[PDB]
Amino acid sequence: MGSSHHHHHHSSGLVPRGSHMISLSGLTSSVESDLDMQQAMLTNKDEKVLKALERTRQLDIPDEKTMPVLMKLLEEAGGNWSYIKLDNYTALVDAIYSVEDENKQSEGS
């Protein structure tokens, strides 16, 4: 009136792996960028700025990285698109190519 009926088997538990990091959802942890949004407020855009994104979008470039890129050109050009567009905003090509490249190369923050 006392028999044991159980079984056991070895198992490691192999699971898949993926290298994808993105804040798809909100109201959650990983709020290290949620604050950075404040900086973008002190650096809005303009009507002409939308023109730059035109050439960038062609190469599939996000306005998030292009924002600080285009503003970098007008900085030295004192806000002159005439010259900056002398090569179809070539500056964006070499600029985005640099930033877009090497994204993991860093210590942390």
XYZ file of N, CA and C in Angstrom:
327
model
N 0.827 -1.201 0.000
C 0.000 0.000 0.000
C 0.865 1.256 0.000
N 2.073 1.138 -0.544
C 2.977 2.272 -0.596
C 4.039 2.117 -1.666
N 3.642 2.299 -2.921
C 4.567 2.173 -4.042
C 4.811 3.528 -4.700
N 6.055 3.768 -5.102
C 6.422 5.026 -5.741
C 6.396 4.892 -7.261
N 5.658 5.783 -7.914
C 5.549 5.764 -9.369
C 5.992 7.098 -9.964
N 7.297 7.247 -10.165
C 7.849 8.474 -10.727
C 8.998 8.166 -11.683
N 9.331 9.132 -12.531
C 10.412 8.963 -13.497
C 11.240 10.240 -13.615
N 12.485 10.093 -14.058
C 13.379 11.235 -14.216
C 14.245 11.079 -15.463
N 14.709 12.202 -16.000
C 15.548 12.190 -17.193
C 16.460 13.412 -17.228
N 17.659 13.234 -17.774
C 18.625 14.322 -17.868
C 18.155 15.382 -18.861
N 18.536 16.630 -18.611
C 18.149 17.735 -19.481
C 18.931 18.999 -19.134
N 19.480 19.647 -20.156
C 20.256 20.865 -19.960
C 19.384 22.102 -20.155
N 18.476 22.031 -21.124
C 17.593 23.151 -21.396
C 18.155 24.092 -22.443
N 18.343 23.581 -23.654
C 18.880 24.383 -24.748
C 17.862 25.418 -25.215
N 18.275 26.681 -25.232
C 17.400 27.767 -25.661
C 18.062 28.610 -26.744
N 17.234 29.292 -27.551
C 17.717 30.147 -28.639
C 18.409 31.405 -28.124
N 19.037 32.143 -29.033
C 19.739 33.369 -28.669
C 19.593 34.423 -29.762
N 19.525 35.687 -29.353
C 19.385 36.769 -30.310
C 20.047 38.049 -29.839
N 20.613 38.801 -30.778
C 21.287 40.052 -30.451
C 20.490 41.248 -30.963
N 19.396 41.561 -30.274
C 18.546 42.682 -30.658
C 18.186 43.532 -29.443
N 18.641 44.781 -29.444
C 18.367 45.695 -28.342
C 17.626 46.934 -28.835
N 16.381 47.087 -28.398
C 15.568 48.230 -28.794
C 14.413 48.447 -27.823
N 14.172 49.705 -27.470
C 13.097 50.048 -26.546
C 11.751 50.075 -27.264
N 11.319 48.912 -27.741
C 10.048 48.800 -28.448
C 8.898 49.312 -27.585
N 8.869 48.876 -26.329
C 7.822 49.288 -25.402
C 8.322 50.387 -24.471
N 7.419 50.917 -23.651
C 7.786 51.969 -22.723
C 7.345 51.672 -21.304
N 7.209 52.719 -20.497
C 6.792 52.564 -19.107
C 7.482 51.368 -18.461
N 8.743 51.151 -18.823
C 9.515 50.042 -18.278
C 10.955 50.459 -17.997
N 11.757 49.514 -17.520
C 13.156 49.785 -17.206
C 13.911 50.246 -18.450
N 15.227 50.378 -18.320
C 16.065 50.815 -19.430
C 15.699 52.232 -19.861
N 15.518 53.114 -18.883
C 15.166 54.502 -19.159
C 16.406 55.388 -19.188
N 17.449 54.915 -19.863
C 18.696 55.665 -19.967
C 18.658 56.622 -21.155
N 17.661 56.447 -22.017
C 17.513 57.292 -23.197
C 16.257 58.151 -23.096
N 15.310 57.710 -22.275
C 14.061 58.438 -22.087
C 14.330 59.873 -21.645
N 15.472 60.083 -20.999
C 15.848 61.409 -20.521
C 16.543 62.206 -21.621
N 17.305 61.511 -22.457
C 18.022 62.154 -23.553
C 17.064 62.945 -24.438
N 15.802 62.528 -24.457
C 14.789 63.199 -25.262
C 14.718 64.683 -24.921
N 15.108 65.025 -23.698
C 15.088 66.412 -23.248
C 16.071 67.258 -24.049
N 17.195 66.655 -24.423
C 18.218 67.354 -25.192
C 17.690 67.745 -26.569
N 16.944 66.838 -27.190
C 16.378 67.089 -28.510
C 15.448 68.297 -28.489
N 14.917 68.609 -27.311
C 14.012 69.742 -27.156
C 14.766 71.061 -27.292
N 16.011 71.076 -26.833
C 16.839 72.276 -26.903
C 17.460 72.429 -28.287
N 17.170 71.477 -29.169
C 17.699 71.506 -30.527
C 16.649 71.056 -31.536
N 15.594 71.853 -31.680
C 14.518 71.535 -32.613
C 15.024 71.557 -34.052
N 14.095 71.498 -35.000
C 14.443 71.514 -36.416
C 13.849 72.735 -37.109
N 14.013 72.800 -38.425
C 13.491 73.915 -39.208
C 12.890 73.424 -40.521
N 12.393 74.359 -41.325
C 11.790 74.019 -42.608
C 12.847 73.537 -43.597
N 13.988 74.219 -43.612
C 15.081 73.862 -44.508
C 15.729 72.548 -44.082
N 15.743 72.297 -42.776
C 16.330 71.076 -42.239
C 15.662 69.839 -42.831
N 14.388 69.974 -43.182
C 13.633 68.867 -43.761
C 14.152 68.524 -45.153
N 14.829 69.480 -45.779
C 15.380 69.279 -47.113
C 16.552 68.303 -47.077
N 17.361 68.396 -46.025
C 18.515 67.519 -45.870
C 18.085 66.060 -45.759
N 17.049 65.813 -44.966
C 16.539 64.459 -44.773
C 16.122 63.840 -46.103
N 15.847 64.692 -47.086
C 15.438 64.227 -48.406
C 16.530 63.374 -49.046
N 17.766 63.856 -48.975
C 18.899 63.139 -49.548
C 19.307 61.968 -48.659
N 19.136 62.137 -47.351
C 19.488 61.097 -46.394
C 18.543 59.905 -46.505
N 17.249 60.192 -46.615
C 16.242 59.143 -46.727
C 16.542 58.225 -47.909
N 17.163 58.784 -48.943
C 17.505 58.016 -50.135
C 18.396 56.831 -49.780
N 19.364 57.066 -48.901
C 20.285 56.018 -48.478
C 19.752 55.287 -47.251
N 18.487 55.533 -46.925
C 17.856 54.897 -45.775
C 18.537 55.319 -44.477
N 18.467 56.611 -44.172
C 19.077 57.142 -42.960
C 18.024 57.734 -42.028
N 18.089 57.351 -40.745
C 17.150 57.833 -39.727
C 17.356 59.308 -39.400
N 16.254 60.030 -39.225
C 16.315 61.452 -38.907
C 16.891 61.672 -37.512
N 17.029 60.588 -36.756
C 17.567 60.665 -35.402
C 19.076 60.890 -35.428
N 19.748 60.247 -36.376
C 21.194 60.375 -36.512
C 21.552 61.501 -37.476
N 20.664 61.761 -38.431
C 20.887 62.814 -39.416
C 20.693 64.193 -38.798
N 19.819 64.273 -37.800
C 19.544 65.536 -37.124
C 20.841 66.224 -36.710
N 21.637 65.537 -35.878
C 22.916 66.063 -35.392
C 23.968 66.141 -36.492
N 23.689 65.492 -37.618
C 24.610 65.488 -38.748
C 24.471 66.762 -39.574
N 23.261 67.015 -40.060
C 22.993 68.201 -40.865
C 23.349 69.472 -40.101
N 22.965 69.519 -38.829
C 23.247 70.675 -37.988
C 24.750 70.915 -37.879
N 25.530 69.864 -38.104
C 26.983 69.959 -38.033
C 27.539 70.705 -39.241
N 26.849 70.593 -40.370
C 27.273 71.259 -41.596
C 26.963 72.751 -41.541
N 25.716 73.080 -41.218
C 25.291 74.472 -41.128
C 26.104 75.223 -40.079
N 26.650 74.483 -39.120
C 27.452 75.079 -38.058
C 28.635 75.850 -38.637
N 29.421 75.177 -39.472
C 30.585 75.800 -40.092
C 30.167 76.706 -41.246
N 29.058 76.360 -41.891
C 28.551 77.143 -43.011
C 27.702 78.312 -42.523
N 27.641 78.485 -41.205
C 26.860 79.566 -40.634
C 25.417 79.547 -41.097
N 24.945 78.374 -41.509
C 23.576 78.248 -41.974
C 23.445 78.494 -43.464
N 24.412 78.000 -44.231
C 24.401 78.172 -45.680
C 24.268 76.827 -46.385
N 23.073 76.546 -46.892
C 22.815 75.292 -47.591
C 23.307 75.363 -49.033
N 23.463 76.581 -49.542
C 23.925 76.783 -50.911
C 25.211 76.007 -51.171
N 26.201 76.207 -50.307
C 27.484 75.529 -50.444
C 27.388 74.082 -49.971
N 26.699 73.875 -48.854
C 26.531 72.538 -48.297
C 25.852 71.608 -49.297
N 25.085 72.191 -50.213
C 24.383 71.416 -51.229
C 25.151 71.423 -52.546
N 26.366 71.958 -52.514
C 27.204 72.024 -53.707
C 27.544 70.625 -54.211
N 27.345 69.629 -53.356
C 27.629 68.244 -53.716
C 26.488 67.327 -53.285
N 25.285 67.885 -53.204
C 24.112 67.117 -52.803
C 24.229 66.664 -51.351
N 24.728 67.552 -50.498
C 24.895 67.243 -49.082
C 25.847 66.068 -48.890
N 26.920 66.048 -49.676
C 27.908 64.981 -49.594
C 28.381 64.779 -48.159
N 28.380 65.858 -47.383
C 28.807 65.797 -45.991
C 28.030 64.733 -45.224
N 26.752 64.589 -45.553
C 25.898 63.605 -44.894
C 26.340 62.186 -45.234
N 26.823 61.998 -46.458
C 27.284 60.690 -46.906
C 28.478 60.216 -46.085
N 29.477 61.082 -45.950
C 30.676 60.754 -45.187
C 30.393 60.790 -43.688
N 29.450 61.637 -43.290
C 29.085 61.767 -41.884
C 28.328 60.535 -41.397
N 27.222 60.224 -42.066
C 26.409 59.071 -41.700
C 27.214 57.779 -41.796
N 28.075 57.698 -42.804
C 28.905 56.516 -43.009
C 29.802 56.265 -41.800
N 30.237 57.346 -41.160
C 31.105 57.244 -39.992
C 30.306 56.835 -38.758
N 29.263 57.601 -38.454
C 28.418 57.319 -37.300
C 27.779 55.939 -37.411
N 27.095 55.697 -38.525
C 26.437 54.416 -38.753
C 27.403 53.259 -38.521
N 28.680 53.498 -38.795
C 29.705 52.476 -38.616
C 30.202 52.451 -37.174
N 30.621 51.276 -36.717
C 31.118 51.118 -35.356
C 30.120 51.676 -34.345
N 29.175 50.838 -33.930
C 28.160 51.247 -32.966
C 28.397 50.584 -31.613
N 29.058 49.432 -31.632
C 29.351 48.697 -30.406
C 30.653 49.184 -29.780
N 31.521 49.764 -30.603
C 32.802 50.273 -30.126
C 32.599 51.375 -29.092
N 32.653 51.001 -27.818
C 32.471 51.957 -26.733
C 32.596 51.269 -25.377
N 32.826 52.064 -24.335
C 32.966 51.532 -22.986
C 31.600 51.260 -22.363
N 30.764 52.292 -22.310
C 29.438 52.144 -21.738
C 28.539 53.324 -22.045
N 28.624 54.362 -21.220
C 27.808 55.556 -21.405
C 28.604 56.656 -22.102
